[PDB]
């Protein structure tokens, strides 16, 4: 009887979800070609070891990334 | 995450309020009362839970507009700060900015 | 058949700090690793519980009964044997009698003609046998509205140990025309102090009464003016309506409890539904 | 695009109605057919427990005069199970039977007998002019006239203390403004409706605070497992699958909640097995489609539903995607499925689903 | 433009919902009943709309 | 400042509306009706405020 409340709520929530996807897309996809750092690391004397992606790892997260990831029920 | 997950907890908890009816279990009044008189009770829950769901949706729209203003201030810092050198004082960092 | 007794060391009662004791499972449903908040009759934390002796010394007051009662006895040979409950205790109301025979408990919700100072006479005969020859509890039972007998458990009734292991706690409630008994027992290697620490209370039995209980007096076994009895002491605390928060473990045992009206920090804990308050 | 439609759910298979162990019949006939009824100020109270009830024979009979149920419906008392029953019997003047219903004012509803606002039992009244009414005066039926204050629900009062009406203290058994609070009625065969006596019984009953005690038809069936079915273990309807559970249930334990509000794992009557209840599989379908100006073949994404349990399947972390083949090639995203999977329509021609390619590589 | 025009369509369409009443036209429940007892139906439309 | 002070003023006035009940004084419905059925009126006020 109450009419089209259900459709209204579903539209609102779906819009929120799509907006979130667009948010991440817009923040990160600023570059069109994925580059690759050379195996040589003669950067003048700057040790970029921590931030560059960590090869010997499951994923490509570097040290700082994994530290942050560690820093930061559902079935019901 | 804490603020987000603190809403669904309130939402699901709302399924334990009678809103004036005789019982908050929707399979109870259906299996205790007749057909004609039950809707008097069953209607009260709808008008309650509907309000419960409407409030949760509205809050999200407001909260999702706070983030939308931080995914635009990040998609900007990611442009001047990273892909260039910014002279906007105190935008990228604190002091004269390098990279 | 009732004999008055005055072989008593006339002393005033004692006071003790009931630290964190007296938490009982309110609802029969099962939980796990959840922090439920409830409101019911409990024993308020850190209360002044009244302490009596029972060895020389002979304490047997008739104490008022309201909002149930938390009765906790540290007992060797558990000389205590039963309780009476009622309003007049003179065959004018349905009196409750929970005599615990060594064989089993017997529950008599019957109008009863008690004595003026009744006491179980289980006969000072120190020849390894104490044949009871004195039913000095009541005189007549015209009526009997309820007659229940539990499983024939035979509990220990002897010992003179220096560190009384046996601590037996009971909580008695009377609501919605129903009498509720929860109880628990523990071996405690202490001597006199009510054991600090936390425990639970396994429900014993809920039965129908429909009677107006307002007064009660314990019962204990025992010649009249001369006897040999094991050391015992017992504590009485008066319950109260209150609001608590609990912490059921994965097994389902109540692990910890938190008050909601003791002090401000308890109120903040109660509001946050959390046991650790951050700055 | 990808649209969302038609939330699905699996359907129940059969029923299970296992009630407590059978026993003997309830003695309600004894309560109604009792030779002597009492008066209102001393209403007769009885408890009913631990027996198989039967309310069809109670109801269908014309042996009753008026019948009103205030919490339930007479057609299906023969399904519920109750914690306990209370039967209250007395006899009242007909005109005042209307005050038995809760929340009213009246001499038999203010000063002697009450009901609460939360009543659940059923009221049954029956004319007994033939037996109760006597020619010589059956005035053993007394009833309260005055009360110092109204009494609370089910607060029986038997006191016959002489009530004081005025300022002077009430002395002796009688005096000015002193009254005996009980009055006898008038019941004779010469009387008509409104002044005939009526035998009135109230069947209150209360739920769920203990293991169920009073029930009706038994028809215990089975305890089948891993099958979406209905259940009625003690008067707790629902739907879901069942299995043995390893939860630690102390002797007095059933009806787990375990997080928020749900009727989680429970035991059963007639046996002591700690069962479990998890609802049948459900999720939201979604339809992937190129524009209808291009084709009419589509794919379907069953969200959060293991492909194996759904009844060109390719399970993706999102859900069971059926209708498209997984190429090893990496193209741009056209119809975003999710979790790093994107579909498209390619050349014969068909709908494909592949892994997204974040642009190209350029060292 | 599409988003705004979508709101009014739902808003106007909502005028055709019973909300528990016995019609969706005020006159339909005003030309079929008296005034003292038909306020209950009109009560259920006001709160609904 | 004006816009904010305009919100509270409207808020307080909403305590003087019947919302369909008999009166806007919560110490009035009690002292005119019986306990059992006066609950219906008080329910309207709560759903109102
Ligand atoms: C316990 O009693 C003593 C003496 O009356 C008193 O000083 C103290 O404050 C009381 N404590 C409690 C818990 O009321
Ligand atoms: C129970 O105890 C009483 C008092 O000691 C005694 O008279 C009676 O015989 C006992 N009954 C049983 C079953 O031992
Ligand atoms: C309690 O549960 C834990 C985890 O399931 C288990 O390891 C432990 O043995 C259980 N204890 C008892 C006695 O139930
Ligand atoms: C009832 O009890 C009997 C005896 O314990 C048992 O065999 C039976 O399975 C139980 N359930 C029935 C038959 O309803
Ligand atoms: C009274 O007894 C008669 C004969 O046994 C029976 O038919 C009738 O149903 C009984 N009425 C009740 C329900 O008390
Ligand atoms: C689907 O179910 C099967 C068993 O029938 C299981 O092996 C498989 O892992 C499940 N799908 C998952 C968890 O991805
Ligand atoms: C391509 O994907 C399919 C399905 O995952 C897989 O079976 C096949 O081995 C893959 N082939 C290559 C070239 O990796
Ligand atoms: C015992 O029951 C009879 C029943 O007629 C009653 O008259 C008597 O007063 C009762 N005695 C007590 C002490 O309750």
From Swiss-Prot, chain C:
Effect of residue 130 to R: In strain: Omicron/BA.2.75
Positions of disulphide bridges: 2-115, 110-144, 260-270
Effect seen on changing residue 124 to Q: In strain: Omicron/XBB.1.5, Omicron/EG.5.1
Impact upon substituting residue 7 to N: In strain: Gamma/P.1
Glycosylated position list: 4, 48, 101, 127, 143, 212, 251
Effect annotated for changing residue 39 to H: In strain: Omicron/EG.5.1
Effect recorded for residue 161 to E: In strain: Omicron/XBB.1.5, Omicron/EG.5.1
Superkingdom of this protein's organism: Viruses
Outcome following mutation: residue 135 to L: In strain: A23.1, Omicron/BA.2.75
Substitution effect: residue 81 to I: In strain: A23.1
Effect of residue 132 to K: In strain: Kappa/B.1.617.1
Resulting phenotype, residue 125 to E: In strain: Omicron/BA.2.75
Residues covered by region (Disordered): 121-142, 151-163
Start and end residues of each BetaCoV S1-NTD domain: 1-272
Effect of residue 117 to Y: In strain: Gamma/P.1
Record's subunit section: Binds to host ACE2. RBD also interacts with the N-linked glycan on 'Asn-90' of ACE2. Cleavage of S generates a polybasic C-terminal sequence on S1 that binds to host Neuropilin-1 (NRP1) and Neuropilin-2 (NRP2) receptors. Interacts with host integrin alpha-5/beta-1 (ITGA5:ITGB1) and with ACE2 in complex with integrin alpha-5/beta-1 (ITGA5:ITGB1). May interact via cytoplasmic c-terminus with M protein. May interact (via N-terminus) with host bilirubin and biliverdin, thereby preventing antibody binding to the SARS-CoV-2 spike NTD via an allosteric mechanism.
Function: Attaches the virion to the cell membrane by interacting with host receptor, initiating the infection. The major receptor is host ACE2. When S2/S2' has been cleaved, binding to the receptor triggers direct fusion at the cell membrane. When S2/S2' has not been cleaved, binding to the receptor results in internalization of the virus by endocytosis using host TFRC and GRM2 and leading to fusion of the virion membrane with the host endosomal membrane. Alternatively, may use NRP1/NRP2 and integrin as entry receptors.
Protein name, per record: Spike protein S1
Protein species of origin: Severe acute respiratory syndrome coronavirus 2 (2019-nCoV)
UniProt gene name: S
Residues of the full protein shown: 14 to 310 of 1273
Curated annotation (Swiss-Prot), chains E, F:
Domain of life, per lineage: Viruses
Cited function: Subunit of the fusion protein that is processed upon entry into the host cell. Mediates fusion of the virion and cellular membranes by functioning as a class I viral fusion protein. Contains a viral fusion peptide that is unmasked after S2 cleavage. This cleavage can occur at the cell membrane by host TMPRSS2 or during endocytosis by host CSTL. In either case, this triggers an extensive and irreversible conformational change that leads to fusion of the viral envelope with the cellular cytoplasmic membrane, releasing viral genomic RNA into the host cell cytoplasm.
Effect on the protein upon substituting residue 30 to F: In strain: Omicron/BA.1
Coiled coil: 1-42
Protein name according to UniProt: Spike protein S2'
Gene: S
């Amino acid at each position: 009887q109450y009419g089209s409340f259900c459709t209204q709520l579903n539209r609102a929530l779906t819009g929120i979800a799509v907006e979130q996807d667009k948010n991440t897309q817009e923040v990160f996809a600023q570059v069109k070609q994925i580059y690759k750092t050379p195996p040589i690391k003669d950067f003048g004397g700057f040790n970029f070891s921590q931030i560059l992606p960590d090869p010997s790892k499951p994923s490509k997260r570097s040290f700082i990334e994994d530290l942050l990831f560690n820093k930061v029920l559902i079935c019901a | 995450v804490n603020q987000n997950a603190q809403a669904l907890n309130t939402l699901v908890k709302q399924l334990s309020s009678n809103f004036g009816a005789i019982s908050s279990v929707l399979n109870d009044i259906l299996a205790r009362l007749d057909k004609v008189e039950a809707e008097v009770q069953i209607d009260r829950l709808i008008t309650g839970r509907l309000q419960s769901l409407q409030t949760y949706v509205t809050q999200q729209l407001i909260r999702a507009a706070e983030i939308r203003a931080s995914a635009n201030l990040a998609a900007t810092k990611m442009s001047e700060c990273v892909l260039g050198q910014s002279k906007r004082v105190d935008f990228c960092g604190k002091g004269y900015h390098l990279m | 058949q009732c004999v008055n007794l005055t072989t008593r060391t006339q002393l005033p009662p004692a006071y003790t700090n009931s630290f964190t004791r007296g938490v009982y499972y309110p609802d029969k449903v099962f939980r796990s690793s959840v922090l439920h908040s409830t409101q019911d009759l409990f024993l308020p934390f850190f209360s002044n519980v009244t302490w009596f002796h029972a060895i020389k010394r002979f304490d047997n007051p008739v104490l008022p009964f309201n909002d149930g009662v938390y009765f906790a006895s540290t007992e060797k040979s558990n000389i205590i044997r039963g309780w009476i409950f009622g309003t007049t205790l003179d065959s004018k109301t349905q009196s409750l009698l929970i005599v615990n025979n060594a064989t089993n408990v017997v529950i008599k919700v019957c109008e009863f003609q008690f004595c003026n100072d009744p006491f179980l006479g289980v006969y000072h005969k120190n020849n390894k046998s104490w044949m009871e020859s004195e039913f000095r509890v009541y005189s007549s039972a015209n009526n009997c509205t309820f007659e229940y007998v539990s499983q024939p458990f035979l509990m220990d009734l002897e010992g003179k140990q220096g560190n009384f292991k046996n601590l037996r706690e009971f909580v008695f409630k009377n609501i919605d025309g129903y009498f509720k008994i929860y109880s628990k027992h523990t071996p405690i290697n202490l001597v006199r102090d009510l054991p600090q620490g936390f425990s639970a209370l396994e429900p014993l039995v809920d039965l129908p009464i429909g009677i107006n209980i307002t007064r009660f007096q314990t019962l204990l076994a025992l010649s009249s003016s001369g006897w040999t009895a094991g050391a015992a002491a017992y504590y009485v605390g008066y319950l109260q309506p209150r609001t608590f928060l609990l912490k059921y473990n994965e097994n389902g045992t109540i692990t910890d409890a938190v008050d909601c009206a003791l002090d401000p920090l308890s109120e903040t804990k109660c509001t946050l539904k959390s046991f650790t308050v951050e700055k | 695009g990808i649209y969302q439609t038609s939330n699905f759910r699996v359907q129940p298979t059969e029923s299970i109605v296992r009630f407590p162990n059978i026993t003997n019949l309830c003695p309600f006939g004894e309560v109604f057919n009792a030779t002597r009824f009492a008066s209102v100020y001393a209403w007769n109270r009885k408890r009913i427990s631990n027996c198989v009830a039967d309310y069809s024979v109670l109801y269908n009979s014309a042996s009753f005069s008026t019948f009103k149920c205030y919490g339930v419906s007479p057609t299906k008392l023969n399904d519920l199970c109750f914690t306990n029953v209370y039967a209250d019997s007395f006899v009242i003047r007909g005109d005042e039977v209307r005050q038995i219903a809760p929340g009213q004012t009246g001499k038999i509803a203010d000063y002697n007998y009450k009901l609460p606002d939360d009543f659940t039992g059923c009221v049954i009244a029956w004319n007994s002019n033939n037996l109760d009414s006597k020619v010589g005066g059956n005035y053993n039926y007394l009833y309260r006239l005055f009360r110092k204050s109204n009494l609370k629900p089910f607060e029986r009062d038997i006191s016959t203390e002489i009530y004081q009406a005025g300022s002077t203290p009430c002395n002796g058994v009688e005096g000015f403004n002193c009254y005996f609070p009980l009055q006898s009625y008038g019941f004779q065969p010469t009387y008509g409706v409104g002044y005939q006596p009526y035998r009135v019984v109230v069947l209150s009953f209360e739920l769920l605070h203990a293991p169920a005690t009073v029930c009706g038809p038994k028809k215990s069936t089975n305890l089948v497992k891993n099958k979406c079915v209905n259940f009625n273990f003690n008067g707790l309807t629902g739907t879901g699958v069942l299995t043995e559970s390893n939860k630690k249930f102390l002797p007095f334990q059933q009806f787990g909640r375990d997080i928020d509000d749900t009727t989680d794992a429970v035991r059963d009557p007639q046996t002591l097995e700690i069962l479990d209840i998890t609802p049948c599989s459900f999720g939201g379908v979604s339809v992937i489609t190129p524009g209808t100006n291009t084709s009419n073949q589509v794919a379907v994404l069953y969200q959060g539903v293991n492909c194996t349990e759904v009844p060109n399947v390719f399970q993706t972390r999102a859900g069971c995607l059926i209708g498209a083949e997984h190429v090893n090639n990496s193209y741009e995203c056209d119809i975003p499925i999710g979790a790093g999977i994107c579909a498209s329509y390619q050349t014969s021609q068909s709908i494909i689903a592949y892994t997204m390619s974040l642009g190209a590589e350029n060292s």
